Amino acid sequence: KVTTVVATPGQGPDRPQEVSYTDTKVIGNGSFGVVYQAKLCDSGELVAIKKVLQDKRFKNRELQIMRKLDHCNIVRLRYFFYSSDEVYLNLVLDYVPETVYRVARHYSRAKQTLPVIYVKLYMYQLFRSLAYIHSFGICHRDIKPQNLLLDPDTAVLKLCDFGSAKQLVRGEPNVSYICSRYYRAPELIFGATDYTSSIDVWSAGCVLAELLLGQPIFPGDSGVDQLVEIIKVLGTPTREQIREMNPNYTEFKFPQIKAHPWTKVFRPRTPPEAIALCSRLLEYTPTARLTPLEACAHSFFDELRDPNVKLPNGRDTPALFNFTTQELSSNPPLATILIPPHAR
Numbered sequence: 216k217v218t219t220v221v222a223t224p225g226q227g228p229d230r231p232q233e234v235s236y237t238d239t240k241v242i243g244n245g246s247f248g249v250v251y252q253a254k255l256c257d258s259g260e261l262v263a264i265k266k267v268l269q270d271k272r273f274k275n276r277e278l279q280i281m282r283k284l285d286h287c288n289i290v291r292l293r294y295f296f297y298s299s300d301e302v303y304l305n306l307v308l309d310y311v312p313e314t315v316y317r318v319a320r321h322y323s324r325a326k327q328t329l330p331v332i333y334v335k336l337y338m339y340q341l342f343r344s345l346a347y348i349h350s351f352g353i354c355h356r357d358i359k360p361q362n363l364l365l366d367p368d369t370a371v372l373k374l375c376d377f378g379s380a381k382q383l384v385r386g387e388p389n390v391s392y393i394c395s396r397y398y399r400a401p402e403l404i405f406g407a408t409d410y411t412s413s414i415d416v417w418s419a420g421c422v423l424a425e426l427l428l429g430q431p432i433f434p435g436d437s438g439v440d441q442l443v444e445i446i447k448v449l450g451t452p453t454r455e456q457i458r459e460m461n462p463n464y465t466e467f468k469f470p471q472i473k474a475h476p477w478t479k480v481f482r483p484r485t486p487p488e489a490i491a492l493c494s495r496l497l498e499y500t501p502t503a504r505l506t507p508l509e510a511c512a513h514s515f516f517d518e519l520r521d522p523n524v525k526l527p528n529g530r531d532t533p534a535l536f537n538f539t540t541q542e543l544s545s546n547p548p549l550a551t552i553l554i555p556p557h558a559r
């Protein structure tokens with residue numbers, strides 16, 4: 216059976232139009248509602264449909280954000296429409312079934328690690344989309360492998376699920392119990408309500424580490440135990456470090472503990488540039504962590520800037536250097552490193 220609805224295009228001019236889709240099936244569940252998978256009658260293309268109960272009085276954060284964003288490493292909002300005593304906002308997004316979580320798991324059940332080339336690819340695209348959204352003052356606040364969608368053929372990564380995303384404003388408080396526990400920044404565990412988009416960088420570091428290790432680097436049993444797991448690696452933070460985090464709750468029973476050597480945390484083979492990048496992302500002090508652009512310009516990604524580089528299946532790497540001035544907003548003179556002359 217075919218369903219026709221009147222939907223406004225997410226990126227185009229605010230003009231409604233009739234849109235038709237068929238073959239609808241439930242693929243997702245959350246505290247927000249339901250996520251369906253359908254096929255557009257016109258294009259034949261597959262989409263996901265996130266159905267969210269909305270209150271007329273208040274505007275939807277995710278919708279306001281998805282209409283701003285237009286990036287290759289970010290899931291696209293095709294259209295959006297309302298369905299029936301309550302109203303549901305329906306977001307029509309690009310359907311990409313494969314996730315980084317699924318891929319990593321596939322390897323880790325095999326007890327082997329993902330090839331470094333795939334790791335460099337995925338992470339780089341992640342920092343790109345992050346550099347993009349951070350330029351608007353927008354923080355994703357739910358960076359995790361399950362929200363990184365992959366096209367296996369092109370190896371293109373797209374950030375998705377902006378259900379926790381928000382445009383941060385200085386002086387305005389934000390919720391501390393946010394983000395997936397394993398990827399939750401330390402300041403959040405300290406109850407900080409005045410944090411920056413640098414928490415996403417933390418989460419990104421957690422993703423990188425998990426791809427090198429084959430398992431999550433900080434596997435907390437609770438919101439507080441997560442901190443202990445962090446400590447078991449970074450040691451206990453100095454008072455200056457805790458000050459930078461700006462905690463709502465001052466302290467926990469934990470004793471002073473010396474840090475573990477990064478080298479020893481990872482496997483013996485693990486590349487040094489990878490490890491070196493991890494230590495720069497996973498810092499206690501939020502201001503000490505790299506910006507998404509600085510991370511892209513890291514030595515770890517130099518293999519991608521080689522003019523001879525190709526995919527393992529012989530195909531060419533996706534557009535990795537098509538930077539907009541909006542993306543370079545953070546630090547424009549990094550363009551002479553991010554953009555190799557052969558790519559100009």
Ligand SMILES: O=C1Nc2ncccc2N[C@@H]1Cc1c[nH]c2ccccc12
Pocket residue numbers: 242243244245250263265290308309310311312313364375376
């Ligand atoms: O935008 C997305 N598109 C997708 N396409 C295929 C698989 C997963 C996703 N995720 C986001 C849509 C989404 C967002 N939250 C979800 C929860 C359950 C299932 C799906 C979602």
Ligand SMILES: [K+]
Pocket residue numbers: 221222223231295296297
């Ligand atoms: K509409």
